[model samples]
Target: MTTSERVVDLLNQAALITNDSKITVLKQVQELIINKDPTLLDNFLDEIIAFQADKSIEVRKFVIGFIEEACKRDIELLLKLIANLNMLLRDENVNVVKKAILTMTQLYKVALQWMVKSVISELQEACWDMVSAMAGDIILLLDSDNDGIRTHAIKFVEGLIVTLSPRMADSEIPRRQEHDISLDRIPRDHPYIQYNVLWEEGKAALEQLLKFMVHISSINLTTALGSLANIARQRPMFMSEVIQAYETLHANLAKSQVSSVRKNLKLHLLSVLKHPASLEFQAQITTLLVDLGTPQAEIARNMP
Candidate 1:
């Protein structure tokens, strides 16, 4: 059989396996995604999403597996694939909302570059509008007593803030001078100083952003945190604030002990401390090192 026919046959066979079956079936699903067989995956999306509604925890985990793998290569395909999942993100049913949020968090990371790439502006705009619609839904959900909604809302907003930070940064003037200003005469904080102070509004978006970032499978928290660190460099005043924000956000997750997310956050925080461009972030880093009880004599000793 052709590869297409073989993948279809495999997907059909795999679907028959009970959740008790070896991850053999899920592994096959992972392989199908790794292989990038559009015909099979496109057809398989609905079947997998249908499984999202299954009461079986193992079955739902398998569905999450499909969503995670599908995004690694073809995010656009995954977006199309998960159209059926959008409703669940806002579903009042607790489990439905939980899985849907999990799926969206994973989807958000992969979808980010696509949303920004000029080649797909129309689609990107549509995606943003959809996000806007859901943003309101999630904002309202934030007040709910449900732990899942409250928790996911916080994560959702975090991701949205990161996603929209650029726009927020752009909305304000880069820098202004009431006195003499010349090239190479930019203030130490330059472009980033004021925008970060407005992070209160930026923080408003995080409830949705975090929802998107919290559940991503590979959890590119490094890329996400790196983006924030980049801003900390350009705007020194905000450096301490953003670093503290990143550290606190991460520490909270670590305490929760979700192994994958915690690991991502820890490594991501380390990445922030070591990134080369952190010449801007360096002062804030040193401050943190000092806080760890390094002797004053040893301060700046390891600073590059």
Candidate 2:
């Protein structure tokens, strides 16, 4: 049988044309991923990505499973699938689209390793190009006076701008900060705020920098290191920013500002260090931490 036909048969049988459906499907896909030929697996990816928004949660979930398993072996395929993911985000079907987007967003952290320099450049380039086209399309919808199309076009623009915005404005930061802080910012009332953005952003930025160190071809370490070193030496006052950011994070944790996010910031930083390029960056990070209170006027001694 052809590859497509074989895949259909397996999915049908595994999905239990008879009984023991979920486990059978899971096992079958797991086996396929582990033992199947690469060519056939590629063919399956072509099929499964199109079905990630299937009405059946089981089917949609199976799509995620296959994507996750396939990515560890074929990052190239994973890169291709992210573009297809936008379809689910934009789909008209209610729960199907909603679940698909939710599942896919969750998968981003799992698949982040593949989004290194080259991959990110390509993805961003494509995203920007698509936005430009979408903008033009929005103009057409606006001209036609189609309210539904206009509404959809507005949503698409908002999503595109939000995703592409770099260095989010300070106004946005306060709004987001308020959202995170206001939820449970009371000690015994709720307990689990270490995972909030008041902490996650710093850790995530450090992790992202580490990943770039390992996977980036265009990044200049000397420039970054020198800048950090200079800040540590010439402008010692800047350390207050780090101190305040950490204090804000710690205070939120003490107050239990969040109740669900128990992120290990230290551990996440360590994971980035596990990358081969981490040693060099770690040295720079350490240097910045250590020699920060030097001949640049010694302000910390006076604070106490």
Candidate 3:
């Protein structure tokens, strides 16, 4: 049989697969795409999208395996199917949301270059809009009474920041690591670029992080700090608001744990201070850092 015929045969078998062995079918299908012919993935895109709404949570979770592998294989194809994936971002199931968010982060990394296009397919725009919205939804969970929800939400934000603003060396000596992407790289005409699609959401997330800075667990706090610092660097225009949030929380943060939390806060503050976009705020940051009691020596530490 031709590859296409064989893929159909596999799908026919997968259709009857029970929950107990669904992953086996998924693995077999994943291997088919990876080993036999990558383009075989195209034939199964609809089937995979259908699985996102499967009655079985495990089966729905398994759908992300396909999304991740497909994006890694061909982001162009992933873009075409993005609308279907976007639906999962709002899945009533939190586990489903978790899996979808993880997959979305992978897609974000792969789609970074494509985001600069002046115009994109409707499906691509849907995917971009979904992620922008997802970021806000996830951040709002920080206000949840459930500790588990708050923890997962912080984790999701951390993943977004790391993927979108990974550390990059500047000079040979590596002065500061939070430089944001140049606006020139993004087409000024793109709706996402010109309209500030992500700016408000990013600012809101930063404010929430600051609000809960001293109240969350250490692990979540670290994630929040990193994500907050990254967002501030990317949206330097919001630096003033960020500082205000910090100041609002300062009294509480001072009375709370002073070791790791303060250490990370100092690190994030320095990251913002050293950014070129932050040059205008150097004086304010300098004073703020001192008021926060970050020693001059600690502030002067060499950037990694």
Candidate 4:
């Protein structure tokens, strides 16, 4: 019934540069624990983290998945696991780094919610440093050579701003003002409240995405427009700002800009009007739609 000892031996065998029996059994060990009884994870959590450095990328990918799984199952696992994750972000393999960034998109929000709900008085300074290192770190990914990585970076910032913003639009304000999510509502002394720092960080990231849309990159123009449309759908704060940018870009549309870029801008702009920003904003969006070649009837069909 005790597997930690067996796990240790399997881990040691795994270190012997052999893969089949040791790695397979290790997978079996985790699957058994993760499905039937997660308590089994407690026995070998460190073993899982250590395995992340295995010579095989497959092993490391499995490790990344397990970390994401365990952390989602138990947010408290973040403090123990995030440092290993940070190292993986620097892993030599692009695929490993890709999954790591994708994994962070989910875990970052989970960490923020943990900050809002938990009271961690023990080891408070150590915890604070962990949270501090994480907030704005994803912004750097936007500049990466890979468009896919930049896409994830765009999404990470999208989710970051959404997580920080209150759910309600102007008329849809919070049920309890006390439950609203303004930075002012969060006390500076609150444990793990360093999340307040992301307000500026995500703001800067959003600005970068905005600039990408203004300039030309067919990849980013498409990637970031959909992200902003989705965000403005959920948070009207972006509607006025995003539509203004849309109009500006429309006025400045160049013959050199690919038709593929034009197609995406049209498609996502309609999606942006997927909701009513109400009266004047709606009028302007409709007018822009008409000017951009969206038929008035189709624009009416698209609007809320």
Candidate 5:
């Protein structure tokens, strides 16, 4: 059989085969995606993606891999891919959900670029709209029961907050400012209102993280505490709100086993004061740090 005929044979087998055999069948199909068959993604991608509904968790995980892999190579596939991805996000297996989260994070960047690339495809615009809700949904997973899922979920919203902001992480020694333009820069009448959609949901996620910091697990508190500092440094506009959140959290806490909580927040606040954006609020944060028993030497070292 020709490769196309052979691939179709595999797809048919995948639909009827035992779960184990279907994985074998699906593995062969994935080679088309990884090997970059020039036509298969457009032609057979939907067939391959159809395996997402497989009752087998392994089959579903591999199917998510196909979506992530294909989307990386062809941004166009997102139009066909996200609906299944949305289902996988709600999959009963935490592993499936994490794979879906990883794929969505990768998809979120490319989808934004695809939107801004030119005048858009209507389908692509709807796809862009679907993703921000997924972003917000991932944040809610932080409150879930699985220890593993909560870790990945915390990283998801934390990174989402910083990435959607313009600031390069501290090591960007070479900055790229104009490209990371603020959300408001996109005009009110702009066709790509998706940027604001993302920001609004992202801000809502940030608000939820702030709530998680109070009396939640230590893991949640620390990540949530550390999260706003990164965003605050990147966009100093958030300086007061974030710092104010920190202190509000402090006063609301009791001092049983919790010197550690205040200790962690002090470090995050001082780290914020170390950034150039911190120059605008140096005194406010520094004074807070000093009162937390940060020595003048430690406080002075972080100044802009």
Candidate 6:
């Protein structure tokens, strides 16, 4: 049978496909994808896309792993499949949506790594588009009503900040480096420059997360505090602004009825202030804690 025909038969059999049977068929499909010529991906594309919405949740979840594997052999497949992946974000089943987001986040990380090492213009452009699309989905998920979803989304953004914040700070030197390459040939819209901007713009994401802290449930407080602390540690420029936002949150919480949230928010805020990054803001932090009625000795103990 032709490679395409063989792939279709496996996909058809996998659907009915008891757990053990299903994995066997999918494993064969993965082998087909890995060993076949890259061009055969086009032949299998429709079947692969069709399986993403498989009736069995397990199948749909497995589809993500299948896609991740296929992309390792051919990333352009991801660019074509991303819209379908984005659609998965709104799946009625929360687990499916979570799996989709996790897969997309992983795909984005691989794409970024490729962009850094690839010198081929076409490959770089394709990787850039893939990264941007994945990033857009992540940002949209940040506002999801499900705290679990929002936490994962925040973690994705946080990971990006940790990876790129340092490079972004150093990007300015490269832009000014004396080189024979003409500025005219280098487009302002180039992927290289755009990636730098994306990292630098993480400040906005941090700002939004801080604002979101005061409104989330106590269940989500730990995630918010951890995200805030990470951002504070990595991006010191925003420390003062974060402190102001924390003070605002404390004031608002004091007037609210959710006493547990207020108390936990206070503890988390104190923990965040204890980070070494907050040393410069010691006086401001102490004053804010005092204003919130924390004991002076408690504030002093947290400071040094």
- TM-scores of the candidates are 0.51, 0.36, 0.68, 0.83, 0.79, 0.68
Better of 2 and 4 by lDDT: 4
Ranked by TM-score, the better of candidates 4 and 5 is: 4
Model 4: worst 10 consecutive residues (lDDT sum): 171-180
Clashes of each: 18, 0, 0, 0, 0, 0
Point out the higher-scoring one by lDDT: 1 or 6: 6
The models' CA-based lDDT, in order, is 0.51, 0.38, 0.63, 0.69, 0.73, 0.64
Report how far off residue 191 is in candidate 6 (Å). 5.5
Global Cα lDDT for candidate 6:
0.64
Give me the runs in candidate 1 sitting further than 4 Å from their true place.
33-39, 87-106, 118-124, 132-162, 166-237, 243-294, 302-304
Residue 293 C-alpha lDDT in model 1:
42
lDDT of 3 by residue, 107-205 (tens): 654565566643676777766765566566767777666556676677666444433332323311123422323333444356654424343444445
Instruction: Give the Cα-based TM-score of candidate 1 against the true structure.
Output: 0.51
RMSD of each: 10.9, 18.0, 5.2, 4.2, 3.9, 7.1
lDDT of 2 by residue, 106-188 (tens): 34333422332232465544543443333334323322233343333333322222222222122122243232221122223
| Candidate 6 local lDDT, 1-304, one digit each (tens) | 9776887799898766666567678778777867765566666766766777666787777777777777877776765676677667668877787887777656665665555545447646755765676676676677788878887877776655544444323122223222212112233455464644655555555655666676554555656666665556555555677677777766663336466665655675676577676788888787777766678777767753
Residues 1-304 of candidate 5: C-alpha lDDT, one tens digit per residue: 6777778888898898875778888888778545746567678877887778778888898998888888877878888888888999999999999888877766676666666655777887788778767877888888888766776776777667655554433322215433433444444466766556656765776777677665356666776777677667665666777988887876673356477877888889888877776666777787688777788888887776
TM-score of 2: 0.36
Best model per lDDT? 5
Runs off by more than 4 Å, candidate 6? 1-12, 18-50, 69-84, 90-92, 167-192, 253-259, 291-304
Where is model 2 more than 4 Å wrong at Cα?
1-6, 12-23, 87-124, 127-242, 249-304
Model 4, span 1-304: residue lDDT tens: 4555665676676667566455686677677567656777766788768888787887787788888988877777776888888888778887787788788777776666566666665554465466556546666777777777677777877776666654544423324433334443345677556545656655666677677666434666677888777767666766777788778778874456657766777787887776666444887887788887877778777776
